[PDB]
Design a protein around this ligand. Structure first.
Ligand code: CLA
Ligand code: CLA
Ligand code: CLA
Ligand code: CLA
Ligand code: CLA
Ligand code: CLA
Ligand code: CLA
Ligand code: CLA
Ligand code: CLA
Ligand code: KC1
Lengths: 188, 174, 169, 191, 173, 213
C-alpha cells in the first residue's frame, strides 16, 4: 500500500488514517521512533501544540499590526512585532514574566498529562477537555471535520508564524508591510 | 491506373515514351496527375493573364495608394510583377499558401486513394456527376492546360530571347 | 604466434634468419608474458606507422590554422614543443581511449577470449574470411609495424642531425 | 563475390575492372556493402555538384523569375538582391558575380553550420536505415518522397533495379565530371 | 477526432503531427480545455487591444491618481504598466478564485468532466439544446483559433514592424 | 593468487555492444531504456551498496543494486541538466525573450547574463532559498531509495508517479520504454550541453552571452 501524498513510497506502517491530517506523509519514517522518550504520541502532541501556538501567533501579529497594541501597551508604535516586544519589555516587563511563569506551570502540567496519557490510554494527544461550547458532543462526522480543520489551519499557520518571525527579524518592518513590499517588487 | 484515368486522347493514345507512369507506385502517378493538373491550372491562368495584360485591358483605377492599375498596363506583364507593391505580393503569397495548406490537408489526400484538389473558396466545385460527361470535361482541362504550359513557356522565351517564335517577337508586349 | 616466419634476413648479422627470431628468448623465459608482448608490439607498431606518415605529411601540406603554418613552424621536429595546447588534447583523448582498455589489459591471459591486439575494429570489412590469409594479413601488419618502429628512429635522427626535408641527407 | 554484385554492367564488359576488383576478393560482405554505399554517396553529391556548378557558372541566383530582369537562365541579372545574410550584407547577387570557387568563400561560417547540421541529421538517418537496420539495398536511406519504392513491391522488380543501376551510373558520370569541371577551375588540363 | 466539436469543414480533424495520440485520452482532454481557455483569453485580448488601441476608454478615474485619459494615450501593451499595483492585485485575485473554482468541480474535465463554465454570474448552461451547443462550441473554438493568431500578430507588430503587412502604418502599434 | 574480482564483474561470455573488445558487465542486461552495454570502466559492477550515503550500512542490513543507484543518479542528472541548460539559455535571451522574474533583483540591469546569476544571488539570498526548497524535495523523495534497498518497494529508478498530463496512462510497455529512452537520450545530451555552456563561458576568452562561443 502506497502513501497518498508520496505515491512512489510505501505507506508508513504506524499511520493508518486514524488521526485527522493523515495522508501518509512521513518519508523519513519519524513516526517509527520509539526510543528517547519520543513516539507517535509525543510527535502528535508536539504537532498539535505547534499548530495551536502558531495559530495564535499569526492573529496575535495581525491584531497589533492592524488595530494597534492593547491599551496599557500603547508604547509599542512599531509594526515590526519582533521589535515591539522589546518596547513592552522595556516598560512593563512584569506582565510578560507573569505570562511566562503562567505558561511554565501550564506547560509542566501538560508535560505530565502527555507522559501519563501515553502510559495509559485515557487521553488523546493534544486533548485537554477544553470543549466548553461542546462541539464534540454530537455529529461525529462533523466533529472529525473540526479535528481536521484544526490540523489543516494549524499546519498552515506553522509556516506563517515561522515566516513572520524570520521576515520580521530580518526586515524589521512588520508582516503586512512586508506583504505590500513584495507586491510592488514582484508586480508584472 | 494509367489506363483508368483521363488524359488519354485521340492523336496520342497513352503518350508515355519514358514509361514514367509505371516507374513508381500508384501514389507516384497520383502525384504526377496532381502535378500535371496544378501546372495546368496555373499555366491556364498564366496564358490568360499574359494576353489580357498585353491587350491593355485593366481594372479601374488604383491598385495601391501609390500604384495605379494603368501604370502596370503600359509595361510588359512579366515586368509588371516587379512593380506590384511588396504588401500586395505578400497578400498574394498568403492566400496561395493558405490554399496549398488546405488542399494538402483536406481529408483523404490525393496521393492516397483521394480526390484531386478542388476550389478552396467558395467550396462548390461545379462538377458533373455524369461519369461519361465528366471524364471528357477533365480530358478537356488537361490538354487545354497542356497547351497553356507550352504557351507560357513561349511567352517567356519571347520576353528573354528576342525571336524564338514566328508569330511573336514583333509585339512590344511579349 | 603469427609473427614468426621469414625469410627476411637480419642486416649486420648475415647468419641469423628471422624465423622464430628470439635470441634473448623471452618466449621460453616467460611464456605467460607473450600475449602481453604481442599487445605491446602491435601498439608500438600501430603508433609508429602513423608516426611515419605524420612526420612527412606536414612537410608539404599543413592544417589551415595559422599557428601551424610553415612561417610559424618550418620544421616538424619542434612542433611537439611549439604547440602545447594541441598536445594535451591529443594526450587527453588518447588517455580516455587507453583507460577503456585497462579491463582488456587486465584479462589478457586466459580470462576471456580476446586475442591480443584485436580491438574488434574493422569498419571497412577488410579482414578476409578464410583463415590461412588472415595470418598473412596479421603478418603484414606486424612486418609493416616493425618496419615503422625502425623507421621513425631513422626519420627523427635523420632530421635532428641533418635538418632537411623528406628523404634525407 | 565482388564480380557478382550489383554495379557491374556492359560498359566494362559485364565484369568489374581488376584493380578495383583486387581490393575486394578476400573481404567480407560488409566490405562490398561499404564500398557500394560510398560509391553511391559520392555519386550523390557529385550529381548535385554539377547543377550547383551549372547555376554558379551561370547567374541563376536567387530570386528565380523566368521573365526578363528576373535572374533566370536566360537573363541572369537581378534587381532585388534577396540578401542571403543580413548581418553580413551579402546577397545572392554577390555570389554569382565572382567565380565558381569564390562562391563558397563568401558564405558565412554560420551558414555552413546550418547546412552541416541538417546534413549531420541526414547522415544519422542514413547510417541507421542502412547499417543498423541492415538494409540489403546499398544506398537505401529510407528517403522516397513520392513513393517510387512502393512499386510492386518491392525491391526485386525491374523498375527499381533499372533505377538503381541508372542512379549509380549517372553518379558515375557526374563523379568524373565535377572532377574535370573543378580541374579547369584549378589547372588547365582539359585534355 | 471528428465527433469532437473543433473538427470543422476545411480541415477536420486537423492534426498533422498526430499530437492527439501523443498521450492518453486524458491528455487530449487537457489539450481541449487549454485550447478553449487560450481561445477565450485571446478573444478578450484581441478585443482589448482593438478597443484600447483606438481611444475607447471609460470615463473618469481608474484610481486616485491614474485616470483612463492617460492609459488610452499609450499603446495598450505598456498601458498595463501604469495600472496601479493594487489594480493588478484585484484583477489577479479574482482570476485566482476563477481558476480555483473551475478546477475544483466534482469531476475533472481531464477525467471526462465539464470544461470551465461561468463562475460569477453563475448562469446554468446544461440543457441548452446539444445540437445548438454543438454549433456554438465550434464557433467558440474557431473564433478562439483566429484570435490567438490575432493577438500574437498584435504583439509581433508592436515590436517588430512589418511582421504583418496589414498593421505596418497603424498608430496603435 | 586470490580469485580475481575481474571474473565477478564481467560476463566473460558476451561482449559489450558499444565497446566490442570489452566483455559485457554483469548488471547491464539491455532491460533498462538507454542500455547499449556501455560501461568501459565497469562502474555498474562495483559491489558497494551506494545507498549508504543516505542511510549508513550500520543502521540496518540493506542493499541497493548498483545499477539501480546509478540509473536513479543518471536520471536525476538528466532531468536537472535539461532544466539547467534550458534555464541558462532562457534567462540569457537565447530564445528571443530574455526571460526574467518580475522582481528587479533579477533584472537584466542587475544581473546581465546567466553567467553572473549564481554569485549575485548567493549574496542576495535567492540561492539559499532554492537550496531549502530543493533540499526539502530531496529529503522527501530521496528516502524511497532506502525503501528499495530494504527490498520493500518495487519502484523503478527515477519512477515517481508524476505524469500530470498522463502521457503514459494507457500505453504499452514498449512505447513506455521508448518514451523512457527519449528522456534518457535527451537528458544525456543536455548533460553534455550544460557542460559546454558552463565551461565555454568560464574560459578567459569570455563570451558570457549566447551563443557562448
Ligand atoms: C510538367 C508538368 C507535367 C506533369 C507532372 C505531367 C504528368 C503526366 N502526363 Mg503530361 N504533359 C505535359 C506536362 C506534364 N505532364 C505537357 C506540357 C504536355 C504537352 C506536351 C503533356 C502531354 C501529355 C500527353 C499527351 C499525355 C500526358 C500524360 C501524363 C501522365 C503520364 C505519366 C508520366 O509519364 O509522367 C511524367 C513524369 C514527370 C516527372 C513529368 C515530366 C517532367 C519532365 C520529366 C521534366 C523535364 C521535361 C523537359 C525539361 C522538357 C520540357 C521542355 C519545355 C521547355 C517545353 C502524367 C500524369 C499521359 C496521360 O495523361 O495518360 C492518361 C498522356 O497521354 N502528358
Ligand atoms: C503566541 C501567542 C501570543 C504571544 C506570545 C503574544 C504576546 C504579546 N502580545 Mg499578543 N495576541 C495574541 C497572541 C500572542 N500574543 C492573540 C491570540 C491576540 C488576539 C488576536 C493578541 C492580541 C494582542 C493585542 C491587542 C496586544 C497584544 C500584545 C502582546 C504583547 C504584550 C502582552 C502580554 O505580554 O500579556 C501577558 C500575558 C498574559 C496576560 C497571559 C497570557 C495567556 C495565558 C498564558 C493563558 C494562555 C492559555 C492558552 C492560550 C490556552 C490554554 C492552554 C492549556 C490549558 C492547553 C506580547 C508580546 C499587546 C502589545 O503590546 O502589542 C505590541 C497588545 O496591545 N496581543
Ligand atoms: C494584551 C495584553 C495586555 C497587557 C500586557 C495589558 C497591560 C495593562 N493594561 Mg490593558 N487592556 C487589555 C490588554 C492588556 N493590558 C485589553 C485587551 C483591554 C480591553 C481593550 C485593556 C483595557 C485596559 C484599560 C481601560 C486600562 C488598561 C491598563 C493596563 C495597565 C495596568 C493594568 C491595570 O489595569 O491594573 C489596575 C497594564 C500596563 C490601565 C492603563 O494603565 O491604561 C493606560 C487601564 O486604565 N487596560
Ligand atoms: C497567373 C496568375 C496571375 C498573376 C500572378 C497576375 C498578376 C497581376 N495581375 Mg493579372 N490576370 C490573370 C492572371 C494573373 N495575374 C488572369 C487569369 C486574369 C483574367 C481574370 C487577369 C486579369 C487582370 C486584370 C484586368 C488586371 C490584372 C492585374 C495584375 C497585376 C496586379 C493586380 C492583381 O494581382 O489582380 C489580378 C487578378 C487575378 C489574378 C484574379 C484571378 C485569380 C482568381 C482569384 C482565381 C479564379 C477566379 C475566378 C474563377 C474567375 C477568373 C478566372 C478566369 C475566368 C480567367 C498583377 C501583376 C492588374 C494590372 O495591373 O494589369 C496590368 C489589372 O488591372 N490581371
Ligand atoms: C471574394 C471572395 C473570395 C476569396 C477570399 C477567395 C479565395 C480563394 N479562392 Mg476564390 N472564388 C471566388 C471568391 C473568393 N475566393 C468567386 C466569386 C469565384 C467564382 C465562383 C471563385 C472561384 C475560385 C476557383 C475556381 C478557385 C478559387 C480558389 C481560391 C483560393 C486561392 C486563390 C487565390 O489566391 O485568390 C483562395 C482561398 C482556388 C481553390 O479553392 O483551389 C485551390 C481555386 O481553384 N476560387
Ligand atoms: C570515389 C568514389 C568511388 C567509390 C567508393 C567506387 C567504388 C566502387 N566502384 Mg566505382 N567508379 C567511380 C568512383 C567510385 N567507385 C568513378 C569516378 C568511375 C568512372 C565512371 C567508376 C566506374 C566503375 C565501374 C565501371 C565499376 C566500378 C565498380 C566499383 C566497385 C568495385 C571496386 C572498384 O572498382 O573501385 C575501387 C575504389 C577505390 C580504389 C577507391 C579509392 C579512390 C582513389 C583511388 C583514392 C585515391 C585518390 C587520389 C588520392 C586522388 C584522386 C585521383 C583520381 C581522381 C584519379 C566499388 C563499389 C565496379 C562495380 O560496380 O562492381 C559491383 C565496376 O564494374 N566503378
Ligand atoms: C494553445 C494552443 C492550442 C492547443 C493546446 C490546441 C489544441 C488542439 N487543437 Mg487547435 N489550433 C490552435 C491552437 C491550439 N490548439 C490555433 C492557434 C489554430 C489556428 C491555426 C488551431 C487550429 C485547429 C484546427 C483547425 C483544429 C485544431 C484541433 C486541436 C485539437 C488537436 C489534437 C492535438 O492533440 O493537438 C495538440 C495541439 C497542441 C499541443 C498545440 C500546442 C502548440 C504547439 C506544440 C506548438 C505551436 C507553435 C506554432 C508553430 C507557433 C505558430 C504561431 C501562430 C500565431 C501561427 C487539440 C485540442 C483540431 C480539433 O479541434 O479537433 C477536436 C482541429 O480540427 N486546432
Ligand atoms: C434595458 C435593458 C434591460 C435588460 C436586457 C434587462 C434584463 C434583465 N434584468 Mg432588468 N432592469 C432594467 C432593464 C433591463 N433588464 C432596468 C431599466 C432596471 C431598473 C428598474 C432593471 C432592474 C432589474 C432588477 C432589480 C433585476 C433585473 C433582472 C434582469 C434579468 C432577468 C432575467 C434573469 O433572471 O436572468 C439571469 C440574470 C442574468 C443573466 C444577469 C447576470 C448578472 C451578473 C451575473 C452580475 C450579477 C451582479 C449582481 C449585482 C450580484 C448581486 C449579488 C452578489 C453581491 C452576491 C434580465 C437579464 C433580475 C436579475 O438579474 O435576477 C437574477 C433582477 O433581479 N433587472
Ligand atoms: C536546473 C534547474 C534550474 C536552476 C537551478 C535555476 C536557477 C536559477 N534560475 Mg532558472 N529557470 C529554469 C531552470 C533553473 N534555473 C527553467 C527550466 C526556467 C523556465 C524557462 C527558468 C526560468 C527562470 C527565470 C525567468 C529566472 C530564473 C532565475 C534563476 C536564478 C534564481 C532563481 C531563484 O533563486 O528563485 C527561486 C525559484 C523558485 C522558488 C522556483 C521553484 C523551484 C522548485 C522548488 C524547484 C524544484 C521543482 C522542480 C521543477 C520539479 C521537482 C521534481 C521533483 C518533485 C521530483 C537561479 C540561478 C532568475 C534569474 O536570476 O535569472 C538571471 C530569473 O529571473 N529562472
Ligand atoms: C477581403 C479582405 C481584404 C481587404 C480589406 C483588402 C484591402 C486591401 N488590399 Mg487586398 N487582397 C485581398 C483581400 C483584401 N484586401 C486578397 C484575398 C488578395 C489575394 C487574392 C488581395 C490581393 C491584393 C494585392 C496584390 C494588393 C492588395 C492591396 C489592398 C489595399 C489597397 C491599397 C492600400 O490601402 O494599401 C487594401 C487595404 C494593395 C496593397 O496592399 O498595396 C500595398 C495591393 O497591391 N490586395
Amino acid at each position: 500500500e502506497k502513501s497518498q501524498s508520496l505515491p512512489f513510497m510505501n505507506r508508513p506502517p504506524l499511520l493508518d488514517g486514524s488521526m485527522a491530517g493523515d495522508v501518509g506523509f512521513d518519508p523519513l519514517g519519524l513516526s517509527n521512533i520509539d526510543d528517547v522518550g519520543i513516539d507517535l504520541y509525543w510527535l502528535r502532541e508536539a504537532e498539535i501544540k505547534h499548530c495551536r501556538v502558531a495559530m495564535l501567533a499569526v492573529v496575535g501579529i495581525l491584531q497589533v499590526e492592524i488595530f494597534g497594541p492593547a491599551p496599557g501597551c500603547e508604547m509599542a508604535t512599531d509594526k515590526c512585532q519582533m521589535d515591539a516586544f522589546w518596547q513592552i519589555w522595556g516598560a512593563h516587563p512584569q506582565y510578560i514574566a507573569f505570562g511566562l511563569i503562567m505558561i511554565m506551570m501550564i506547560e509542566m502540567i501538560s508535560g505530565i498529562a502527555t507522559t501519563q496519557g501515553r502510559e495509559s490510554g485515557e487521553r488523546a494527544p493534544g486533548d485537554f477537555g477544553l470543549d466548553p461550547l461542546g462541539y464534540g458532543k454530537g455529529d461525529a462526522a462533523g466533529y472529525a471535520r473540526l479535528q481536521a480543520q484544526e490540523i489543516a489551519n494549524g499546519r498552515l499557520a506553522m509556516f506563517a508564524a515561522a515566516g513572520e518571525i524570520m521576515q520580521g527579524c530580518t526586515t524589521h518592518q512588520g508582516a503586512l508591510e512586508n506583504l505590500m513590499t513584495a507586491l510592488r517588487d514582484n508586480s508584472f | 491506373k494509367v489506363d483508368e484515368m483521363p488524359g488519354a486522347t485521340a492523336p496520342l493514345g497513352k503518350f508515355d515514351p519514358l514509361n514514367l507512369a509505371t516507374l513508381g507506385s500508384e501514389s507516384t502517378l497520383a502525384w504526377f496527375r496532381a502535378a500535371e493538373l496544378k501546372h495546368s491550372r496555373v499555366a491556364m491562368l498564366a496564358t490568360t493573364g499574359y494576353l489580357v495584360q498585353a491587350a491593355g485591358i485593366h481594372f479601374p483605377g488604383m491598385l495601391s495608394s501609390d500604384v495605379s492599375f494603368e501604370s502596370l498596363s503600359a509595361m510588359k506583364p512579366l515586368d509588371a510583377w516587379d512593380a506590384v507593391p511588396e504588401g500586395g505580393k505578400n497578400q498574394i503569397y498568403f492566400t496561395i499558401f493558405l490554399a496549398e495548406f488546405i488542399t494538402e490537408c483536406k481529408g483523404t489526400h490525393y496521393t492516397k486513394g483521394g480526390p484531386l484538389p478542388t476550389i478552396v473558396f467558395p467550396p462548390i466545385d461545379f462538377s458533373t456527376v455524369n461519369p461519361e460527361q465528366l471524364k471528357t470535361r477533365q480530358n478537356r482541362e488537361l490538354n487545354n492546360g497542356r497547351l497553356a504550359m507550352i504557351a507560357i513557356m513561349s511567352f517567356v522565351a519571347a520576353a528573354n530571347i528576342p525571336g524564338s517564335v514566328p508569330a511573336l517577337a514583333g509585339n512590344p508586349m511579349f | 604466434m603469427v609473427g614468426a616466419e621469414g625469410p627476411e634476413p637480419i642486416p649486420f648479422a648475415p647468419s641469423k634468419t628471422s624465423k622464430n627470431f628470439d635470441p634473448v628468448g623471452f618466449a621460453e623465459r616467460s611464456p605467460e608474458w607473450l600475449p602481453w608482448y604481442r599487445e605491446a608490439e602491435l601498439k608500438h607498431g600501430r603508433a609508429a606507422m602513423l608516426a611515419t606518415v605524420g612526420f612527412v605529411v606536414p612537410e608539404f601540406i599543413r592544417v589551415p590554422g595559422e599557428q601551424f603554418s610553415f612561417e610559424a613552424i618550418p620544421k616538424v621536429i619542434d612542433a611537439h614543443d611549439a604547440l602545447p595546447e594541441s598536445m594535451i588534447q591529443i594526450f587527453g583523448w588518447i588517455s580516455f581511449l587507453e583507460a577503456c582498455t585497462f579491463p582488456a589489459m587486465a584479462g589478457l591471459g586466459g580470462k576471456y577470449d580476446r586475442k591480443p591486439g584485436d580491438f574488434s575494429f574493422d569498419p571497412l570489412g577488410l579482414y578476409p574470411t578464410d583463415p590461412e590469409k588472415q595470418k598473412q594479413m596479421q603478418l603484414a601488419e606486424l612486418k609493416n609495424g616493425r618496419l615503422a618502429m625502425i623507421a621513425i628512429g631513422g626519420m627523427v635522427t635523420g632530421a635532428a642531425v641533418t635538418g632537411h626535408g623528406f628523404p634525407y641527407l | 563475390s565482388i564480380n557478382e554484385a550489383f554495379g557491374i554492367s556492359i560498359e566494362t564488359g559485364n565484369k568489374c575492372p581488376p584493380l578495383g576488383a583486387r581490393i575486394l576478393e578476400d573481404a567480407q560482405p560488409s566490405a562490398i556493402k561499404w564500398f557500394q554505399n560510398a560509391e553511391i554517396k559520392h555519386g550523390r553529391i557529385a550529381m548535385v555538384a554539377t547543377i550547383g556548378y551549372l547555376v554558379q557558372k551561370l547567374g541563376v541566383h536567387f530570386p528565380l523569375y523566368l521573365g526578363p530582369s528576373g535572374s533566370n537562365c536566360f537573363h541572369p541579372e537581378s534587381e532585388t538582391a534577396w540578401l542571403l545574410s543580413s548581418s553580413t550584407g551579402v546577397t545572392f547577387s554577390d555570389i554569382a558575380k565572382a567565380a565558381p570557387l569564390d562562391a563558397i568563400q563568401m558564405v558565412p561560417v554560420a551558414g555552413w553550420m546550418q547546412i552541416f547540421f541538417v546534413a549531420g541529421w541526414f547522415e544519422s538517418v542514413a547510417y541507421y536505415r542502412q547499417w543498423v537496420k541492415n538494409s540489403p539495398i546499398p544506398g537505401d536511406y529510407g528517403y522516397d518522397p513520392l513513393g517510387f519504392t512502393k512499386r510492386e513491391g518491392g525491391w526485386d522488380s525491374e523498375e527499381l533495379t533499372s533505377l538503381r543501376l541508372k542512379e549509380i551510373k549517372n553518379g558515375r558520370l557526374a563523379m568524373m565530371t565535377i572532377a574535370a569541371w573543378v580541374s579547369d577551375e584549378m589547372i588547365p588540363g582539359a585534355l | 477526432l471528428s465527433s469532437l466539436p473543433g473538427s470543422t469543414a476545411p480541415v477536420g480533424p486537423f492534426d498533422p503531427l498526430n499530437l492527439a495520440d501523443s498521450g492518453s485520452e486524458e491528455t487530449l482532454a487537457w489539450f481541449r480545455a487549454s485550447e478553449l481557455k487560450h481561445g477565450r483569453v485571446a478573444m478578450l485580448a484581441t478585443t482589448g487591444y482593438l478597443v484600447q488601441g483606438a481611444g475607447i476608454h471609460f470615463p473618469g478615474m481608474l484610481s486616485s491618481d491614474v485616470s483612463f485619459e492617460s492609459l488610452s494615450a499609450m499603446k495598450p501593451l505598456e498601458a498595463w504598466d501604469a495600472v496601479p499595483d493594487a489594480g493588478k492585485a484585484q484583477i489577479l485575485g479574482t482570476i485566482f478564485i476563477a481558476e480555483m473554482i473551475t478546477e475544483s468541480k466534482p469531476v475533472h474535465y481531464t477525467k471526462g468532466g465539464p470544461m470551465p463554465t461561468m463562475v460569477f454570474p453563475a448562469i446554468d448552461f446544461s440543457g441548452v439544446d446539444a445540437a445548438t451547443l454543438k454549433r456554438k462550441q465550434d464557433s467558440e473554438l474557431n473564433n478562439g483559433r483566429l484570435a490567438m493568431i490575432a493577438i500574437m500578430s498584435f504583439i509581433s507588430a508592436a515590436n517588430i514592424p512589418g511582421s504583418v503587412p496589414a498593421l505596418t502604418n497603424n498608430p496603435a502599434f | 593468487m586470490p580469485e580475481r574480482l575481474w571474473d565477478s564483474m564481467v560476463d566473460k561470455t558476451e561482449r559489450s555492444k558499444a565497446v566490442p573488445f570489452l566483455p559485457r558487465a554483469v548488471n547491464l542486461d539491455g532491460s533498462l531504456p538507454g542500455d547499449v552495454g556501455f560501461d568501459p570502466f565497469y562502474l555498474s559492477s562495483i559491489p558497494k551498496d551506494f545507498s549508504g550515503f543516505i542511510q549508513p550500512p550500520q543502521w540496518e542490513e540493506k542493499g541497493i543494486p548498483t545499477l539501480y543507484w546509478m540509473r536513479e543518479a543518471e536520471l536525476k542528472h538528466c532531468r536537472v541538466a535539461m532544466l539547467a541548460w534550458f534555464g541558462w539559455l532562457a534567462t540569457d535571451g537565447a530564445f528571443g525573450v530574455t526571460l526574467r522574474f518580475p522582481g528587479e533583483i533579477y533584472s537584466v540591469e542587475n544581473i546581465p547574463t546567466a553567467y553572473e546569476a549564481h554569485n549575485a544571488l548567493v549574496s542576495q539570498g535567492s540561492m539559499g532559498f532554492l537550496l531549502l526548497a530543493v533540499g526539502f524535495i530531496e529529503f522527501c523523495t530521496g528516502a524511497v531509495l532506502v525503501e528499495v534497498a530494504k527490498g520493500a518497494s518495487d519502484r523503478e529508478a527515477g519512477d515517481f508517479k508524476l505524469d500530470p498530463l498522463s502521457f503514459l496512462k494507457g500505453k504499452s510497455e514498449e512505447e513506455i520504454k521508448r518514451m523512457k529512452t527519449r528522456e534518457i537520450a535527451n537528458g544525456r545530451l543536455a548533460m553534455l550541453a550544460f557542460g559546454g555552456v558552463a565551461t565555454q563561458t568560464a574560459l578567459e576568452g569570455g563570451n558570457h552571452a549566447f551563443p557562448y562561443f
